[PDB]
Each structure stands twice: as C-alpha cells, then as structure tokens.
Write a protein that binds this DNA or RNA. Structure first.
Ligand SMILES: Nc1ncnc2c1ncn2[C@@H]1O[C@H](COP(=O)(O)OP(=O)(O)OP(=O)(O)O)[C@@H](O)[C@H]1O
Ligand SMILES: Nc1ncnc2c1ncn2[C@@H]1O[C@H](COP(=O)(O)OP(=O)(O)OP(=O)(O)O)[C@@H](O)[C@H]1O
Ligand code: NA
Ligand code: NA
Lengths: 552, 220, 50
RNA sequence: UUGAGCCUUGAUGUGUAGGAUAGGUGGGAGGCUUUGAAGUGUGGACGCCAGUCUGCAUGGAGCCGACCUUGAAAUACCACC
C-alpha cells in the first residue's frame, strides 16, 4: 500500500479515424491488489491490458512497472502451433532449463575428452550453474508432473490440433503459469472452462500473492476474485470500491444522470437557436459574444452505442414432427469412449441445452449430427424437412483480411436469406454494424464483434435447425439478453452447448447432461425441475475440490 | 531450561563488533556436545536474479574440524594419487555407478580430472547433491595431486540460498578465539572476492555467530 | 483528413527515416519498402513506426 | 478511541507415495522432559478437517532421533526470515 506495483499517468489511445478508446487514465496498482475490468464490448479493456503488458507501445502518456517484476499476459485468444503435443508445448515454455541440461551433455562430452577440457569451459559454465540454481533445474520432471496433475491437463502425448477447446485453453494457462510471474493480466481467463476448473482457478487467484488484473464478464467469478472494479465507460476508467451489486446501481444512476444532462443541453441549444433566428430590431447589438458562446455549445456527445439489444435469427422452412432421432449411439477414440448407449427424439419448437465436463463429446455430437464423423454403432436419423445451420467454437475459418461487408455479404448488395432477399447493408446492420463499422478489418476487431460477425456469417442459410457450440463465449450481458429473447420467437429447433448455467436456465426446454464413463443423460424440462427430479432421486454429497498447489 | 537462560543471556537487539562476544560464546560450552560452529552470513544483495548466484570454495588455517572425504571416482591415475593423498575410495569409470549406488557417501565432491565418462546419473545424480566438479568454482583444476588440498584445507562449497544466506563452519570451538580471528579475516576476504558486479546498499548486512545448540550473536 | 502521418525508420541500425501517410483503417498492416539510406549509401528495408 | 509503521515474541506452511498437515541448506547427532506422563477430559483459531497448536486439570514420565520403503527428510535452540 505504501508503494505501487504499476503506474499509468494520463494514458491515451487513438484508433483509426478520431476515436479515443482511452483518454486521461491516471491509475496506480499496489502490490497484492486484485482488480476486475468490466465494461461493454468495444470499450477497450483488451487494449488497456495490452498496453499494461507492454506489447502495445504507440500511446500518449506514461506507463510504467517497477524495475523488476515478472509479468504474465493472457490474451483474448491464445495462439498455439497445432503440430506440437502437450509435452512439446510445455517444453517450449520451459525450454531454457532443458537447454541447460543439453549443455550439461555437451560439457560432459568436453570433459570426457581432453580437448577444451579447462581452457574454454570454466567461464562458460557460469550460466550453466546459474540457470539450474535459479530455476528448479533437475527437479523439472517432478514439478511438471505435479503441475499437470493439479491442472488436470490432457495426456502428455496428445496432439494440440486434436485437443479440444477447454483442454487447449488449459494448456495455454499452464504455459502462462509455469514462468512464475508477479503481475498477472488475464483477458477472460474463464472462457472455455467448466465449473470445476473455474472453481479451482478462482480459489487459486484468491490465494495468490502477487497482483492480478482480470477482464471478466462473469459477475460471480468477478465477485469471488476481485477487490475493486475498473469501468472504462467511454475513454474514462472509474475505479469503484465494492461488489458487483452496488456497482450495478451506481452505473444505472450515472446513466440516468447523463440522460438528464443531455436532455437539458438539448433544451438550452434549441432555446438559444430560437434566439439566434430572431431579427435585429433597429441599430442594436445582437451580441457577438452571445453568438460565439452559442457556437461553442456544440461540443458533441458520444452516444453510448454498442449496447446490443436485438438480434435477427431468420425464419426457417416449415418443420415436421420428426426432427431428429438417434438410436443406440456409440463413439470412441481408441480405448477411451465418449458416448455409448445413447438415444433420444427431439420434438418441434425445442431448445436443448447440452452440459457436461470439458472434453466429453459435446462437439463430436454436432460433428456426427451434421455429416462430419461416424459413430461406432450409428442410426442418427434426421428428418426429411430439416435444414441445418451450425456454429462452432473457434472463429478460425474466416480470414483476417476482409471488411465486414465483404466477409458476411460476399460483395453482393442483395442477400437472399433462405427464401426472401434483403440488402446486405441492412442485414449486417441488424447485428449492430453500422455504415462506418462495415469497413473495419476482421483482424482489426474485438472479441465480441468477432463472435457477432461469426453468428451473422453462419446464420444466413435460413435453416430451422440451429447447432450452436458455445455462442455465448465473449458476449456482454446485453447481447446475451438479446440472444435470449431472439432464441424464443424462433420457431424451429435449437441445440445449444454452453457452460453458462444462468444463460441456459432461461431458455432450456430439454437437457443433455454428460456424466462419467460415457453416460449421456436425457431429461425433459428446464433446470428448475431438473433439480427437483434430482432431489426426487436424491444423493447428497459436498466434498467437491482438492485445491492442491502449483509448486513447492 | 538453559535454553530459556540463553534467551536472556543473548540480547541481539544490541550491536556488537567482530570479536566482542567470542568469550560470551565460549561461555556456551555448557551444552553437552562438541558444539561445531555454524556461522551465518546475510548480505545486502538480491538472490532471485539468475546472474548473482554464488558458488565456490576457500581455505582456513585450522581446517573446518571435519573429515572431508573426496573419493577419486575418476579414470587414469587420479584414483592412485588420491589413495595416498586423500582419496576416500577409488572408483573406475566401469564401476562408478555401482560405487555410487552402494556407498556414494563422501565428505567432499568426487574426483575426476580427465576420466569423466559420465557426469553422474544425468539427472541430478551427480549434480543435484552438488557433486558435479565445476572448475569455475574451483572443483576442477589441472593439478592431479591438488585434490589433496580439498581434504587438507577444508574447502567448503559456497551454497547459495534463495535469499543469499551462507552457513559455514569455522574450525570448531576447540580452537581458541585468537584462532577464530584468523579464520574470520579469511572468510571476509573470500566473501569480498566473491562480490557480484551488481551491488547496492551495503555489501554485507548481518552475520550471526553461534554453535549448534548455541545462540546467534550479531557481528555488526 | 483521415490519413495520419507515419515514419519509415531505417533497419540498418542508423538513425534515418522517411515520412509518409497511411490510412490505418483500410490498411492496418505494417509497411515495408526497400529505400535508400544516405548514411550507409545502400538500399535497406524500411519499416514503419510512429 | 483508534490507523500506518518500526523491533521483537510466539503461531504458522497438508501434491502421488512411507511413520504422516510432509516450508530454504543448516550444524549435526541424540536432545528433550519427570520443574512431573504417553494418554482422559477440556475452551479457542485454522482446516485440504486426517489433525498440530494451545489455555486446562486429580493424576505425572518416556515420545521422537536412531532404519529412509521418497523427486525433498525427520515439528532437535538459534538461525539475518
Ligand atoms: N484499426 C482499427 N480500426 C477500428 N477500430 C479499431 C481498430 N483497432 C482497434 N479498434 C477498436 O478497438 C476496440 C477495443 O477492443 P479490444 O480488442 O481492446 O477489446 P474490448 O473493447 O476490451 O472488448 P473484448 O475483448 O471483450 O471484445 C474495439 O472495439 C475495436 O473496434
Ligand atoms: N480426431 C480425434 N483424434 C483423437 N482424439 C480426438 C479426436 N477428436 C476428438 N478427440 C478427443 O475427444 C474429445 C473431443 O473434445 P469434445 O468435443 O468432447 O469437447 P468437450 O470437452 O466436451 O467440450 P468443449 O468444446 O466445451 O471443451 C477430447 O478428449 C479429444 O482428445
Ligand atoms: Na485482449
Ligand atoms: Na469442442
């Protein structure tokens, strides 16, 4: 509290044209502080974290850490090379000690042979001693084993490309945490993680010693890990002390006050306009000073914007009473099997929430359902009146080299969505992408806008069978409620995979819960009465965690 | 009991000098043991930085008071030299693995000037315990018979802690205080010669003089 | 005026730079061209910077 | 009545396996208690809940080292924490 671990004095940032993502930000973070970073999508939280981590440099103002603290930055989406396995990916982050052991082999060669035995070896071994002493050195195997067991990492020899999403994010988290930092900046740490891993992560962060700055959209995780909240409304960060519940009321009151002040400013502007339009009435003044003071009163106002509250899911073709029936489904990859002895039939106008632990067959189910894999048993019969639209976890297919118009529309001013046709500009603007925004490069974009454009790109086939694979990844709560509304008037059928119990509680009509040993429970109803069914077939047990450690 | 007595007997809130309490420490012969010396050294220096780690050896006129055993686990004639000049046991390169697995104990590190078919276990077997002969510290040298000085000088491994703490023996208290002085000067000389380039504040912070069950009086 | 001024630093290690403009909206990529460096009298690749 | 220090003094630190809450190298072997037990009650804080730490009592004395079945070893003062 006496000193600070990071400081920023009047840090501004300008994007193309003239928009101030950040301006006049003067904040200092003390050691032992945990800070949440709330705000709308597009506010600039990721930009601020990049500036804090040092990758972003072209700014205005001062930004400074203390002169030796170790910084660990986790971005919006990590980049991994698919060729590596888990062991190779981890050894890429602990390469230096492995290199030191290889140099031990080299030195043992030079010392077993009388050439270069002492003349060019003693001064060279300074680093060889230093790396092994500073790090764990020969303790690397056991420390890595303990870390993998504590994170529940996948097997050491699994290909990254064949790894799932949650496992991929866990591998990225391990690579981050091996290089023990003191400053810890995380951009949506709980993105593809399940409840168990989220609980472990929040407990670890609460028990942490250094300082943490986390971009969050989960109120519960924020309230369980953070001490205070940065806001970043529009170029202005508002450090608020307290919890989420009070900050919500503070934000609503602030918005109401700004609305009132804007209305008063409009009143004054129109009154002074009605004065300006008057005459002179003789050889009198008309008041050049008043004229200048009126012209100064056009300081412009930034509309809150983003604030998505409506989404467009196009209508599909008329759907019959045989939608999807699977009978005796079975799948395995080698010895480990995902699904076995699974069967169900889906009626009309249903939303099916699919839940389970990380890496359990949820995405493989969709790959089967839409012609991409092959079950070990078979008999996944679709209907004859079914048109399928799919949305997957990773936004990798599209290229980061096209504007939003050229990507979604394909360069055509008319867009025939299913049956009818709509102008491409209007269709893309229905997803909160106005005329100015329709020129932005996809690589020059935010995470939430990336997800929105993914949805708008793949929902244009007009089919009445939605297969959504975690579409609530990096969407703010306003767009989340927009999707919650838009998913209820859509007359077709939807199957949504999501780890957000609160999101699925609103819209789920059927449940697909995964369990151990390849059990895929099918239940009819929402979570509220699913809990009652469980309490009818009740089993009581509360010993959930282990919560061990990372290192000794 | 007498531990509670020495609690009040030592008042380390007050600063002494380099030899102001040697008599008061010799007054701690009441404890039933041979009461070896385990002086502790703390400096003003960072130790997390990788480059500032210190490792080496030194000598003292009276010896450490312990029998340093540096077995000749080498090839050639270093084992023969040690067998008459201070070799705990002779181990050929075709038997070093067995000689380590069975009885690898030794007061000092192993000896291998040129017969170095393996550094030892490749996995901290020969380097984890600190048995790797590092010429940069002083373990390696071109003198075959010079390894006798390892047992004839009480050369000590300059182990480094995560907070730069050095614990070393000074020729157990059987040697008089006027003999402890000529070891104190030597250890300070070696400590200055082991100074890192990156320094700040005061180059030495605090030294604690004590015995095994004794109390740590400040040096200042 | 939507184009902002940018400078093409010299990668030859010397301090020398040209100055041009670039629409950071349509082209967010980093420019690089082989231009002339009078300090070294050789053609070296210049990369953009603030 | 309180905050921030700053010196001490205690108290704490539970991956898989081994005796089992099992921090960094000591220096090293036995110190320790009987100034009254290993145990049985007895109030508190922690807990990952098996326990250690402790006020506590008519009563009251051998526990741990010693042997490593481990990546690391035996809650054995003081260590500059
Ligand atoms: N070259 C650019 N042209 C236009 N806008 C840009 C450009 N570069 C960045 N931006 C804007 O910067 C804003 C900051 O987004 P950023 O990636 O920092 O994440 P964010 O606003 O915190 O949200 P999230 O990561 O949750 O989506 C984005 O809304 C984006 O539109
Ligand atoms: N082609 C493949 N080869 C080998 N293993 C595979 C292959 N496809 C999938 N797997 C394995 O099956 C699982 C696939 O992940 P899955 O789609 O079940 O994700 P999930 O963990 O259920 O969900 P989430 O996407 O939310 O992380 C992983 O365990 C992965 O190792
Ligand atoms: Na980011
Ligand atoms: Na998946």
């Amino acid at each position: 509290m006496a000193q600070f671990v990071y400081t920023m004095h009047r840090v501004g940032k300008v994007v193309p044209p003239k928009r101030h993502i950040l301006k006049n930000i003067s904040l200092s973070f003390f050691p032992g502080a945990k800070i949440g970073v709330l705000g709308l999508n597009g506010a600039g939280k990721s930009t601020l974290l990049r500036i804090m981590a040092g990758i972003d440099k072209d700014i205005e103002g001062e930004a400074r850490p203390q002169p030796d603290i170790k910084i660990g930055y986790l971005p919006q989406e990590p980049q991994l090379n698919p060729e590596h396995t888990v062991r190779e990916s981890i050894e890429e982050a602990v390469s230096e000690v492995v290199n030191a052991l290889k140099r031990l082999d080299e030195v043992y060669a030079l010392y077993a042979d009388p050439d270069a035995d002492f003349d060019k070896l003693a001064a060279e071994q300074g680093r060889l001693e230093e790396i092994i002493q500073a790090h764990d050195g020969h303790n690397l195997n056991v420390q890595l084993e303990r870390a993998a067991d504590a994170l529940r990492l996948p097997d050491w020899d699994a290909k990254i490309a064949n790894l799932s999403g949650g496992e991929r994010r866990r591998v990225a988290l391990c690579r981050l945490l091996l290089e023990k930092p003191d400053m810890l900046l995380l951009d949506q740490p709980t993105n593809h993680l399940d409840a168990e891993s989220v609980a472990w992560l929040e407990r670890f962060l609460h028990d942490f010693e250094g300082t943490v700055v986390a971009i969050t959209h989960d109120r519960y995780f924020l309230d369980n890990v953070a001490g205070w909240i940065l806001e970043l409304d529009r170029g202005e960060g508002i450090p608020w002390e307290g919890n989420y519940s009070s900050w919500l009321e503070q934000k609503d009151q602030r918005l109401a006050q700004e609305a009132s002040q804007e209305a008063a400013r409009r009143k004054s502007i129109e009154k002074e306009l009605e004065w300006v339009r008057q005459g002179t009435k003789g050889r009198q003044s008309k008041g050049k000073a008043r004229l200048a003071r009126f012209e100064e009163l056009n300081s412009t106002e930034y509309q809150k914007r983003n604030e998505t509250n409506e989404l467009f899911i196009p209508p599909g073709p008329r759907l019959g009473d045989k939608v999807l029936e699977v009978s005796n489904l079975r799948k395995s990859y080698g010895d480990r099997l995902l699904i076995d002895s699974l069967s169900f039939s889906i009626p009309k106008g249903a939303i099916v929430g699919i839940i389970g632990p990380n890496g359990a067959g949820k995405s493989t189910l969709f790959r089967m359902i839409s012609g991409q894999e092959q079950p070990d048993s078979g008999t996944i019969t679709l209907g004859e009146t079914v048109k399928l639209a799919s949305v997957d976890q990773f936004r990798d297919s599209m290229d980061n080299s096209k504007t939003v118009w050229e990507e979604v529309s394909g360069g055509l001013d008319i867009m025939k969505i299913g049956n009818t046709e709509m102008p491409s500009r209007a269709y893309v603007g229905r997803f909160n992408f106005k005329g100015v925004d329709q020129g932005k490069r996809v690589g020059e974009l935010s995470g939430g806008e990336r997800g929105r454009l993914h949805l708008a790109k793949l929902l244009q086939v007009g089919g009445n069978m939605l297969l959504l694979d975690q579409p609530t990844n990096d969407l703010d709560i306003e767009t989340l409620r927009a999707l919650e509304n838009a998913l209820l008037e859509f007359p077709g059928c939807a199957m949504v995979i999501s780890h957000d119990r609160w999101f699925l509680d609103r819209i789920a009509t059927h449940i697909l819960d995964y369990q151990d040993e390849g059990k895929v429970e099918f239940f009819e109803g929402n979570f509220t009465e699913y809990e009652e069914y469980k309490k009818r077939t009740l089993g009581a047990d509360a010993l959930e965690p282990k919560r061990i450690k990372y290192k000794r | 009991k007498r531990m509670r007595v020495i609690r009040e007997k030592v008042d380390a809130t007050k600063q002494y000098d380099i030899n102001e309490a040697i008599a008061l420490l010799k007054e701690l012969a009441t404890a039933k043991f041979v009461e070896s010396v385990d002086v502790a050294v703390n400096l003003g220096i960072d130790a997390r930085k990788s480059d500032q780690n210190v490792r080496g050896a030194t000598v003292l006129p009276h010896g450490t008071g312990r029998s340093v055993r540096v077995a000749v686990f080498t090839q050639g004639a270093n084992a023969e030299a040690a067998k008459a000049a201070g070799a705990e046991l002779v181990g050929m390169e075709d038997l070093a693995d067995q000689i380590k697995k069975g009885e690898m104990n030794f007061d000092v590190v192993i000896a291998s000037p040129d017969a170095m078919r393996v550094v030892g276990q490749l996995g901290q077997v020969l380097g984890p315990r600190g048995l790797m002969p590092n010429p940069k510290v002083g373990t390696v040298t071109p003198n075959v018979a010079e390894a006798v000085k390892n047992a004839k000088a009480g050369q000590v491994r300059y182990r480094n802690d995560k907070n730069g703490i050095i614990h070393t023996t000074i020729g157990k208290v059987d040697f008089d205080a006027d003999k402890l002085k000529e070891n104190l000067e030597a250890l300070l000389v070696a400590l200055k010669k082991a100074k890192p380039t990156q320094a700040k504040g005061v180059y030495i912070k605090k030294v604690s003089i004590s015995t095994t069950m004794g109390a740590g009086v400040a040096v200042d | 005026g939507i184009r902002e001024k940018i400078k093409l630093v010299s990668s030859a290690g010397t301090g020398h730079f040209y100055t041009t403009t670039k629409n950071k909206r349509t082209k967010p990529e980093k420019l690089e061209l082989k231009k002339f460096d009078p300090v070294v009298r050789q053609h070296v690749i210049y990369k953009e910077a603030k």
